[PDB]
Each structure stands twice: as structure tokens, then as C-alpha cells.
Amino acid sequence: EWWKEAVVYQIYPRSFYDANGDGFGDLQGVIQKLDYIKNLGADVIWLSPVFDSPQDDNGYDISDYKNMYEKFGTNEDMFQLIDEVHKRGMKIVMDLVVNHTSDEHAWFAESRKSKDNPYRDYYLWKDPKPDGSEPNNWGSIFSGSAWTYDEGTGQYYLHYFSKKQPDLNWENEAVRREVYDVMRFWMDRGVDGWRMDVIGSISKYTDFPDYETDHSRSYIVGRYHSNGPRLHEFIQEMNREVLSHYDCMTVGEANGSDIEEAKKYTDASRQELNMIFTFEHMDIDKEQNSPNGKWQIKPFDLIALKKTMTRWQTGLMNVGWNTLYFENHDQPRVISRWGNDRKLRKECAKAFATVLHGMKGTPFIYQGEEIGMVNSDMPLEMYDDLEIKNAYRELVVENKTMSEKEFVKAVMIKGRDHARTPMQWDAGKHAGFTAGDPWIPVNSRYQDINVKESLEDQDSIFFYYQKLIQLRKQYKIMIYGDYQLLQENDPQVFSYLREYRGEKLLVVVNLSEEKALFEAPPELIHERWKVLIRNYPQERADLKSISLKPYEAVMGISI
Template structure:
């Protein structure tokens, strides 16, 4: 790709349902994003990634798409999207749409035709298998959302595969007509001005055609031999690159849940012409008990040594072989100050410290809506949560298998549930945080009265202004885009520190990611470095970092 604009960019993710509502129906909409473009321009971001806003039954909050070419009426219409693209471009902001190519909704016309018979145009658009002789499922694969990955369809008298909810049947990428149908959708939106794609679970599009049983005794996943990436994955993604991404110069970032850094090389090495970046999940598992049958609901305190090791590994292994996508929060990830920081005494400090660590790395930072004001997890009860993943896992792990108590499940949900990031955006202290004049589709975090965009702007400790400074540093200093990376103090359990270097210029990025003061003897070696950004207004002893204190230092 000739124009690699995304390398010096900061990308802002909007979850439209929870961003801003303009018609008082309680649901955020595309005109709401349009209305806040000047706010985003002021923040300094370069592009907006918009989570799915296509026609959908909303079983999985829009990741179950019924019609890829039609905007769901809850968000507006196609003209609203075209206007949003135009208005964003007028401000120098690019638009990235979300492509869910692994599965559709069971309400898609494709699926409704496919289930009708075994001999129509759409019959092989999905993965259908006959029952075993005893009538049971084709194999023992389990869904990501709990339960079996197979559902029997009475009309067709076969099982269909779904890696996620039963209302999300997986597409059959072995069928070239399916692939072309997806590429045509991408061309359609390119014709309306879309600049790039975030690709949902794109590494799952190829399936092991032998469909072997999974040896995992708990049948938690469809993963066989720890490989959920099918044998033709790279072939399919390369074909997509050649058909759409390369000729139309569209940016791409793929969700690659199981990928390690060496796997990612195969996906993002420019020579291979597949994707520009991938989102890894590896660094987001540092508060998960390894090997526990309860999976992500088995939480433990964040392991900073492991976080540093993982992020450094991605920095090192992708050097010269591709580009990193940098994130801590998104629509599937909880709020960092609540999950890994201290959202009570040190909310501002922990929000800005983690931001400093992330934005100082080599790669493209992604900011999730509300992250730029330090939004936190709500302390909901189980009955308040909406997420299909949470509900199905509660049913499986608490009620059926009883491998985790309801109390511990709730404790985990308050830390890591996807719904923590989906509470509506907190704009001001008016009713419903200024998000809507109607009844919000999802419960507000009660702290909107104190924590909101207006209050943050008026605060001496403004997370928004700190993000502005971080983003400006990336735009103005080539070292953050192209400089080398070296992790220091890898075994320190509290301090995250690394060195960036380019053409003799040296920057030190350092953060105390604990709520206890830390003395850092290493700083003696950097006495000739000057602070260019920090999240404390006053100076301290040069060797002491206060709780969640972060700094970027430059060699004089």
C-alpha cells in the first residue's frame, strides 16, 4: 500500500448504540456521531472505526448482520452514513467500518434461502452437516458463547455450524460465491467513501474440513490442537487483499483472537499482502488464571511482568515484519482504570498512566469512546447485564456445571464483562448524561454526574487534555512512529519502562502502574533526560514515581 496514513494515526472507536442519540429513542445513531465530529477533531484523532451499524436483530449487538448493505433503522439510514463519511472527510477524519465476514445473522436472506433446500444458489453459503447415525451433532465442538457450536435445523434436517450464538451461522468460505459476495459488500462501501476495515474474527473464516473432534474434555471451544485458524485462512485473506484491499488502498486491521506475535507476522508482513495490522488478545489475558475451566471468568490480579513481556514480544517480533495495533479498551474490553488501575483514589492517574504506556509504543493506537475521559466500569448486578456471552456463560458455568459460584462470577463480570464498555457515553451531568432525551437502551453508569466530558474539560486533571497531548506527540515526533523499542526492568512488578530511539534521539517512557510510591534507581542513568509530558502537575524526588505516575522523558 502506497499511502500508509495509518502508521502516524490515532484511531477512535465508536460503539454507535452507546455514543450519542439525536432522536430520543434511547439508542445512539449515525447523526449522533456526525454531531460529535468537532469534538473528535478537537481530540486530534485521524480516523473513526464504527462498530457494526448494519441491519441486525441485535442478538450480539450488531455482530449478527442481516443485510451488509443496509444501515439498521435504529441508527438511521444509508444517507446518514454517506453524510457522516462526507462530513468526516471534510474535517480530515477517515472512516473505518466493521466487517463481520465469519458469520451472518440467521435472519439474513442468505441463510433463510440456504436452510430452505440443499440445491439452491445459497445452499452452500453456510456449513451444513448431517447428524451422526444416532442423531447427534457432527462433532463435539463448542461455541464461544457456551453450549454446542452446532444447531439442528428442522427445515433442512441438518446441523449448521456457529462459532458464536446459534443465531450467528458461520459462512462457508470454501464456496467462492461466498467470498465474492463479501468482497462485493466491501466494494459497495468503498464506492461510498469508506477508507478501511476492522475485520471481526477474520482468522476464523477457514475451517478444518475434516471437522475432527476436539480433545478438550470440557468442550469449551471448537479449537482442535490449539489451532482455530483453518488451513486456507492465509489464502482467503490474501485473496481479499488482492480483490479489494490493495486495489482500493483500504486500511485493514483484523481481529486475531488466538494469534501470537510470530503467527501475526504471517498476517501483517507487507510482503505477504494480507492485512495491515491485527488485534491480539494475548496481552488482555494477564488477569486470567491460566488453564482454569472457567476461562475468562477466572480472574486474578493483573500480572504486570507478563503484560510487559507480551507487549515487548509483539514489539520485537513485528519489527521489520509488520505493524502493531495498540489497544487496552474496546467494545469487548472493560475500562482500564477499573480493571487494572485504581478507579477510586487514582482514576485520572491510572487512566493517563496506561494511556502513556500504550501511546508510547510503536504501532497505531486505538482509543475507545469514553477512554479519553477515563470512564470506569459500573458496579452492576447480574440482572443489569445485557451481553449474550455473559448470559450463556452464567447459565453454563454457574447453573449447569457449577464450576464457579454466582458471587465469583459477578465479581469477574464487574471486572471484565464486555458490557462494562457498553454503558452510554457520559457527555454532561444532565439526565442520562446528555446521551439521550429518551430512556437509554442500557443502564447508565451512575457516576456520570461527576465523570463526564464537560466536567473533565473543567477539571485541573483532565484526561481529555492529556490524550490531546499524547496524540499531538505522535503526530509531531517521528520517533514514536519509527523509533526502535527496548524494554527495561522486565521483571519489575510495578514499573513499566522502555526506551525509544531514532537517529540518535532517545525518549524514555516510564510509568508506575501501582497505587504505591516507587523508588526507581534506574532513573539515575537518565539524569540528563528532560520531561516532555507527565500526568502529575508537581515535581517529586527525581527517583520517585508516585501512584500511577507516568512520564515521557527526552535526552537533552
Template sequence: MATSQWWQKAVIYQIYPKSFNDSNGDGIGDLPGITAKLDYLKELGIDAIWISPIYTSPQVDSGYDISDYRVIDPRFGTNADLYHLIDEAHARGIKVIMDLVANHTSDQHVWFQQSRQSRDNYFSDFYIWRDPQPDGSAPSNWGSYFGGSAWEYEPLRQQYYLHYFAKEQPDLNWENPLVRTAVYDLMRFWKAHGVDGWRMDVISGISKFTDFPDYPTPNGEQFVVGDLHANGPRLHEFLQEMNREVLAPFDMMSVGEAPGSTARNARQFVDQTRQELNMVFTFDHMDIDADPMAPFPQKFHSLAFDLVKLKQSLSEWQNSLFNHGWNTLYFENHDQPRVISRWGNDGQYRYQSATAFATVLHGLQGTPYVFEGEEIGMTNAHNFTLADYNDIEVTNTAKMLGTTVMGLTATELLAAAQQISRDNARTPMQWDNSANAGFTTGQPWLKINSNFPTINVATDRQQTQSVFNYYQQLIALRHDAEWLTAGEYQLLLSNDPQLFAYTRTYAGQVWLIVANLSPEIVATTALQAVLGEQKITQLLLQNYPERQRLDAPLQPYEALIAKLG
């Protein structure tokens, strides 16, 4: 496929605004705080920022429950603050990507407040309503991603409404053309104010299997989340309409969060001939440590890191989308814990681990996404108690558990949360070693990671081994090297449990990306055997000094990018 779009050579930086930088001392990050750090982001070298939801919201699900799409939540500032941020970002050559949450709204949105009143007003069919079963129970056994039923009874209408997430997040009815028109109008509104593109929250869920058949329950489950929650029958029709109405006419970048998608069916989203989305976020590689046989809540029953599975997943997406679409590249975001704590080593080899995982990711074909703090090697918050968590997945599970339910004790839930909870990524950005990590002069909305005195932007940038500096080099390479954009991918040593090695080939030349993703010293004998007569002719990047050849063992979490000849 053509590789001439700006986002194909770009690196995009995700900002979780509550936790990025607080300018007014109220303990919550805000838009002026982001504007104040644009020079920092420019120096890092990123091309665009993706800002998680900043619209008016009751914050039941951290802003993903929107009550007014066109008004900035006062917690974050004003519309004028956002317009100023966009102008300042553009002045620095940085594009601005906003979050589009179009699968659901807040139950406080005026659309829902009207819809719940009756079955015959303008907004009645903006949401998905169904009658109770004869015994008064929910229309089906569909479950919510946050636990419990996906159906909530509304006495005013004497009907149930559907909510894939919290009961305060009713799902929109995309079968209603008025809903689609309203969504496209709000997208045009933000384009008129300078927004360059969209990250689309759970976009694969907007089309429903409207008969909502019961899922089978072989283990006696009361509520089930299954395959029918995503990729409904009209999904691609809706996305093609969105492309015609908004994305193509206004040249807006699009990346969709697509749970339930595979490397094969992702082509339906991103093949340029279909005119839908530019990219989708895959979950395949982020689920390699999920235990499919675990009891609910499965998320808190993690398996050990399996590098072979990670290589299989990432390679499948690389190979499937090559010349058929474009990949997103990420290990961290607002919904994922810190990768070096989850799969790497956030202690003795924190620098090496952070840069090794970055190397294997940024060497792939696709657009890399860097989550705030990833560029300095921030870690999970090992100092949290259950009472410290704000993440609704943890708090809801804690309420259901009491002390022991569903195979977890409170102690086990805490250990699991410290490993996998979304709050591990949402702890405030660690700017320096002053009070509250330089994030705020007030009381932070979420507890600060206790390691901020040693892990922070100011300290990292003074180190000989600087994660920030390494990311700068990776990003610069992404901008300059056409082989990173267009080169063919080939996995090496697919079954090696410690080495992630692959080549990128372009215009008759070959580059090697290799990382030892283990805390052990690993021989390179097998790698040399695969490469044969090919030797390193140029080292482009390495996280250990003084390596010029491949015949020496790889040190713990050692990584390099080299040209072969």
C-alpha cells in the same frame, strides 16, 4: 519497514454507536448523534473513527449478527445518514473505518434463509453443513465461544450447521468462491460510498479445518473451544485474494481481529511483502489475567494483574514485528472492560491511572486505538446487577449457572461481570452531568454508569487534571514525533512488578517512557542504574507536575515521556 502510510501516524477512535450519542430520544445512539460530535473528535485530534456494526441486524450479538450488509439498521438511522456522516468526517480530515463481519451472518440473512431450505439451491453451500452422526448427535465436539455446542440442527435440511458464536450466527463457508465474491462485492459497495478501511471481525476464523476432528477431553468436557477454531489451512490464501480484489486496488486500510495469533505468526498477516492486512488485533496482552486452569466459563475466573506478564507480551509483539509489520495498540474496546478498573485504580488515582496506562501504550510503535470514553477515564459499571447486563456472555452464563454450576455462584458471577464483562465498555457515553449523562432524552438501552455526575466530558475538560487534555497531548506527539513511528524499542527492568519502563531510539537519540503502574510510591534507583549517565534533557509529557529529574521516587501511577542525553 517503511513508515509512510497515513495509518502509521494516526490515532483511531472506536465508536460503539448504540452507546455514543442519541439524537432522537429513543435511548439508542445513532448516526446523526455521531455526526453531531465530530467537532469534539476533531478537537481531541484523532485521525479516523472505527464504527462498530450499524447494518441491519436482529441484535442477538449487538449487531455482529448481520441480516443485510448494505442497509443501515433503522435503530441507527438510514444509509443517507451514514453518507452524510462520511462527508462531514472527511470535511474535517477524519477517515471512516467500518466493521466487516465476514466469518458469519445472522440466521435472518436471506443467504441463510435460502441455504436452510434445501441442499441443492444457489445458497446451499454458503454455510457449513454436516450430517449428524449415526446416533443423531452433532458432527463433532466443537464448542461455541458463547457456550454449548458449535453445531445446531436444522430440521429442513436434516443437517447441522456450524456457529462459532450464537446459534443465530451461522458461519459462512469461505471454501465456496461465491461467498468470497459476495463479501468482496459488499466491500466495494461501501468503498463507493466513501468508506476508507475495515476492521475485520474474527478474521482468523474464516478458514476452517473442514474435517472438524474431535478435540481431546481429558477433563470430560462436552464441548471444546480450541486451537483449531482459528488459523485454518486456507486463511492466508483468502486474505491475499481479498487484498488483490479490494484492499490494494482501492487503497483501503485493514485491521483484522485475530484470536489465536501469536507475535511470531502475526507476521504472516502483516508483513508488507505478503500483501494481506495492515495490522491485526492481538489478544495476548489482554489475556494476562485469564486463568487457563479455571473451569468453564474461563472468562469469569480472572487472575490478579501481573505487570511483568503485560510487559513480556507487549515487548514480544514490539520486537517481533519491528521491520516486519505493524502493531495495533489498545487496552480498551467494545469487547474489553475499562482498563483502569481492570488493572489500575479507578478511585483515588483515576486520573493518574488513566493517563499512566495511556502513556505506556501510546509510546509504543504501532497505531493507537482509543475507545469512546477512554479519553475521559470512564470506569467499569460497579452499580450493575445481573439483571442489568445485556452482554450475551453474561446472560448465557447466568442461564447455565442458575445459582451454582461450573464452580460459580450467582454472586461470584456478578462480581466477575463487574470486573470483566463487555458491558463495562458499552455503557452510554458520559457527556455531562444532566439526566442520562447527556446521552439521551429517553430511556437508555443500557443502564448508565452511576458515576456520570462526576465523570463526564464537560466536567473533565474543566479540570486542572483533565484526562481529555492529556490524550490531546499524546495524540499531538504521535503526529509530530518521527521517533514514535520509527524508533527502536527496548524494554528496561523486565522483572520489575511496578515499573513499566522502556526506551525508543531513533537517529542516534533516545527517549524514555516510564510509568509506575501501582498505587505505591516507587524508588527509581534501579531505573537510574540501568540508564547510567543518561539524564533527562527534555520532558515532553508528564501526569504529575514539577518533575525534572529521575532521582526522586515515582508517585502512584506517575508517568512521563522524556528525552535523554
């Protein structure tokens, strides 16, 4: 169970390092930066998808599972990367994207040709309604209908994501076998595990029932879009046929997951996955179900964060396993989203890191999180993401459920592209990401926020992350201790306790810009503490009462 003790670094490779000058990050670029990742201390890398793809969704629309997209390199480069990871004592996890393929995948190019094609039933085709409209009212995550009509055959195909991402038909045993063959091809060549993209969607309600509607919207995304009736059957089959034959790690991107679903995926006795990503803690700052979805912003609410993260810590405390993340290629920079990214940027970045890394589970560090990368001020016309383009058209232009100004404000907070501007290596041109022209501009603050300056500054966010990772490797309590929320009603302070074999770990973090007070509960007042990490310089170990400075974070271990 090395995956319980791991710290994972997520690379978004088109934006990590461009070794050959075309402005697009590449596999040889990753290889050249592996020493940096090892020095940080992560021991597992998760690479976002590098398989051949027309890039409609930046690699999540795969047109060939057994070849690389040419700008990343060739399979030879990928095999070298695997070897280079292993030579450093690290592991590599690839992105398994098997809810859907590109519409340019050979399977779909064949499927769409005719009802008698042998690939027809690789995808999900249905007749129009009598009036020619879509089979039901289901929506795409990327706006509009989940169905697209094919004039040549007279049927619609299903796509939960873009029209260039047709969903695979997992009811067809041949599709499942194709998926297992892909997994074995890569695992036999040294891939150590998989991050499984929208694994929650692979089983459909094959009666395709309409949702109920209150007429706020024409197309609906809801409970049928995940947790289908055969979901866990399929994952159990995948474990029997593939995962059980390798020393591997699996993490599912479990869209639609709540704590009970997480137990189904992650209880070891069920022989499914090791861990899942949930969205519940990322969902605290949207309204529950507006037509504008995640663009219907709410302010950061620490109480909501504490409630949600505590539900997950206690729910998987003695069964299953948690992932721990605040950032990925789909989320904004957490310090910009929920904190201070200006005068208190360092303290705030370190504070969020401490809250997260003090918990039970496997931490994930998204590229640039460890240097305090921030959201971008770029104008809307500079964004790339199809999610944004499609939502602008639907919400602002067509349906008018958001004004222009409100949509721009929402994108500046939550746009996926805040995660995707290039990694900031130094203060030179394009932050040292490329000698050419980057595929999207580097964030305008890069001259102040970059690896070079971080390694020169002993007070950097980088060295704080490096220390959190070292502590996890030294103190078994951080991996295996239980969890108890402390001072639960405090609106500024996120404090909790871990316990393991008579030892205690106290984590106290002021997630606010104002002064706060932590007082230990009565059962803890006679403990003696050794401070393991703090993001301010004043040092005292009487943690029973702490007058917390803005964004102050501290972890102590009992002695």
C-alpha cells in the same frame, strides 16, 4: 502509510449519542459529535457495525450488508457521515463481519430451506453422528455447542458464535465474491478501511476433527477455531481482489494470534493486512484453559503484561506493525480492571495511557477511555450481553463449574457491558446521551465523570490524551523508533526506551499504588532529558533516578 501515524477513535454507536430521543445512539448523533473527536485529535474513526441486524449480538449478526439498521438511520445518513468525516480531514473504518451472518440474512433464510437451494453451500452443513448428536465436540464462544440442528433438512449448521450467527463457507467461491462485492460497495462510497471481525476464523478445518478432551467440559474451543489451513490464502486473495485497489487501512481482529501469526498477517511483503488486534495482552488475567474461560479470573500481574507487550513490540519491531489498545467494546474499563478507579483514577488512567501511547504501533482509543470511564456497579439483572446470559446458564446453572458469587464477581470485572453503557457527555439526565430512556442505564458515576467536567478541568484525563496525541504528531520517534524494555524485573515499574536517528524517548510508569524507584541503566546515565509529559505537577528533568509517586508516569526525550 497514514495508518502508521494515525490515532483511531472507536465508536460503539448504539451508546455514543442519541440525537432523536429513542434511547439508541444513531448516525446523526455521531455526526453531531465529530467536532469533539477532532478536538481530541484522533484522525481515524472505527465504527462498530451499523448494518441491518436483529441485534442478537448488537450488530455483529448482520442480516443485510448494504443497508443500515433502522435505529442507526438509513444509508443516506451513513453517506453523510462519511462526507462529514472527510470534510474534517479524518478517515472512517467500518466493521467487516464476514466470518458469519445473522440467521435472518436472506442467504441463510434460503440456505436452510432445502439441500437443493442455491444458497445451501453458503453455510456449513453437516450430518448428525449416527446417534443424532453433533458432528463433533466443538463449542461456541458464547457457550454450548458450535452446531445447531435444522429439523427440516436433517443437518446441523456451524456457528462459532450464537446460533443466530451461522458461519459462512469460505470454501465456496461465490461466498468470497459476495464478500468482495460488499467491500467494494462501501469503499467506492468513501469507506477508508475495515476492521475485520474474527478474521482468524474464516478458514475451517473441513474434516471437522474432534478435539481431544480430559473430560472437564463437553464442548471445546481451541486451536481449530482459528488459523485454518486456507486463512492466509483467503486474505491474500482479498488483498488482490479488493484492498490493493484502494488507499485503505485494514486491522484484523485476529483471534488465536501469537507473534508469528501476526507476522503472517502484517508483513507488508505478504500483501495481507496492515495490522491486527491480538488478545494475548488481554488474556494475562485469566487461567490458561479453565472450563470457565475468561471468567476464571487472575489478579493483574504487571510482569505478565510487560512480558507480553514486549514480545509483541520486539516481534513486530522491524516487520509488520502493531496495534495498541487496552479498551474496546468487548473489554472492561482498564482502570477498573487492573488499576485504581477511585482516588487515583486520574493518575491511573493517565499512567495506562502513557504506557500504551509511548509504544510503536497505531493507538486505539475506545469511546470514554479519554475521560476515564469506569466499570458499572449495576446488578446482574441489568446486563444485556448474550455472552453473560449464556455463560450464567452453562457455568452456574447447568454445569456448576462456578458459583453464583464467583460468577457475579467475574462479570463485575470483565463483562462486555462495562464498555457499552452510554457515553457520558455531561452531568444532566442520562449524562446528556439521550432526552428519552437509554437502551441500558448510564453508569451511576456519570455526574462526576463526563465530557463537560473534563473540558472544564485543565488536569483532566481528556487533556492528557489530547497531549499524547499531539506529541505523537510532533515527535517522529514515537511512530518510528525501536523498543527496548528497561528494568525488566521491577514488579511495579513499566519502563522502556525508544530510539530513532540518534534520539531517545524514555517512558517510565509506576503501575502500582505504592512508591517505586526508577534508575536508568548505565548506558543512559549521561543523557540529558526534556520532559514531554507527566501526570504529576512536580517538575525535574534528572530522569536517571526517579522516586515515583503512586501511578506516576513520565515521558522524556533526549536532548
